[PDB]
């Protein structure tokens, strides 16, 4: 089985209103180039979560704070700057409070550019107007 805490406190990081759902996929070493992976998108608190839908585990695989974190798009077609191989195209990246920079992938064109105006939201930047 698989199971963090037994569960019996109320959520937090996952108690805040959905400002955003699908799947996206997250590029990590290891298995296939990229993998699908359902993300949440939440505000108030303002987080991001993604479950692995290959398992099946209710609590999330991850999830980084958005308050303190970035996100942009990579123009650079096909492939980012420097990342293995080749990837596919309209992608974006979230500059953490680590400058991390972490690679994501949405389901469309458009589901991207929503996927990151959404963080943004979440985040500090130009929303207002």
């Known amino acids: 089985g698989s199971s963090g805490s037994s569960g019996s406190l109320s959520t937090v990081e996952l108690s805040g209103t959905v400002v955003k759902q699908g799947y996206l996929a997250k590029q990590g070493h290891k298995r296939k180039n990229w993998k699908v992976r359902r993300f949440v998108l939440r505000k108030d608190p303002a987080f991001l979560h993604y479950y692995d839908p290959s398992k099946e585990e209710n609590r999330p695989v991850g999830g980084f704070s958005l308050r303190g974190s970035l996100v942009s798009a990579l123009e650079d077609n096909g492939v980012p700057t420097g990342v293995k191989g080749n990837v596919q195209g309209n992608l974006f990246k979230v500059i953490t409070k680590d400058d991390t920079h972490y690679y994501i992938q949405a389901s469309s064109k458009a589901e ?11 985040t500090s930047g130009p929303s207002s107007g």
């Open 112 to 122: 991207r550019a929503e996927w990151i105006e959404a963080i943004k939201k979440l």
